[PDB]
Amino acid sequence: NKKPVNSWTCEDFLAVDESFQPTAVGFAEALNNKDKPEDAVLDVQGIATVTPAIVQACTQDKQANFKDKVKGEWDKIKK
Amino acid sequence: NKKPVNSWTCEDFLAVDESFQPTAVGFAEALNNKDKPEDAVLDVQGIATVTPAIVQACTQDKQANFKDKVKGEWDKIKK
């Protein structure tokens, strides 16, 4: 799918090759985090921790918005 | 690594473990799509192909700005 990522559903995400799921999550997270991009830091551990929890959350709610599942899982890595 | 990604030089990127380099490349690309997020497109196979080219380019120019090499290699791929 060449759909813009913010339009991906959880279903679209599960279709990406396994080795690249953390990349799709990192991308969605950074694109929508919207804190100043000049201060944006790569949180490898955060992305690695949330990815399986996202594949999990996504499997249980295939039609949800992918970008939205990322934010909600990422809202447990800081809060 | 706590430096903001937009401040990274090639030396910082070469320090990222091989398994997370494509996530770093995709994260850098997302930071450039902050103004109109709903139009950002993630091309996972493109990330897969270009990452090793950026690693090599960075090895030969360690002092250079990381995002600039990301853009340079991606430009050589499309155009």
Domain ranges of chain B: 1-79
CA B58 to chain centre: 10
Compute φ and ψ for B9, nearest 5 degrees. Answer: -110, 175
Contact call for residues B17 and A14 (beta carbons, < 8 A)? no
Alpha-carbon distance A72 to B13, whole Å? Answer: 28
Alpha-carbon distance B49 to B63, whole Å? Answer: 23
How many other C-beta atoms are found inside a 10 Å radius of the C-beta of residue A42? 23
- A66 contact partners, CB below 8 Å, separation of at least 6: A5, A8, A9, A10, A12, A13, A24, A28, A58
First-residue to last-residue Cα distance in chain A = 33
First-residue to last-residue Cα distance in chain B = 33
Give the homologous superfamily in CATH for domain B1-79: HNS-dependent expression A (1.10.890.10)
**Which chain B residues are Cβ-neighbours of A48 within 8 angstroms?**
20
Residues recorded for chain A: 79
B36 Rama sector, left if φ>0, alpha if ψ -120 to 50, beta otherwise? beta
Alpha-carbon distance B58 to A69, whole Å? Answer: 34
Three-state DSSP at A9 gives strand
How many other C-beta atoms are found inside a 10 Å radius of the C-beta of residue A15? 9
Least Cα distance to B52 among B13, B1, B9, B4 occurs for: B13
Amino acid found at B17: D
Sign of CA dihedral B59, B74, B23, B45: negative
Q: What is the 3-state secondary structure (H, E, C) of B6-54?
A: HHCEHHHHCCCCHHHHHHHHHHHHHHHHCCCHHHCCCCHHHHHHHHHHH
> Residue ranges of the alpha helices (H) in chain A?
10-14, 21-33, 44-59, 66-74
Alpha-carbon distance B66 to B16, whole Å? Answer: 12
Residues recorded for chain B: 79
Least Cα distance to B10 among B69, B79, B74, B78 occurs for: B69
**Which chain B residues are Cβ-neighbours of A31 within 8 angstroms?**
30, 33-34, 37, 40
Three-state DSSP at B1 gives coil
Q: How far is B66 from chain A (nearest CA, A)?
A: 13
Element (H, E) at A35: none
Least Cα distance to B34 among A74, A35, A67, A12 occurs for: A35
* Interchain pair B37, A40: CB under 8 A: no
Which two structure tokens, joined as six digits, stand for A58? Answer: 């996504």
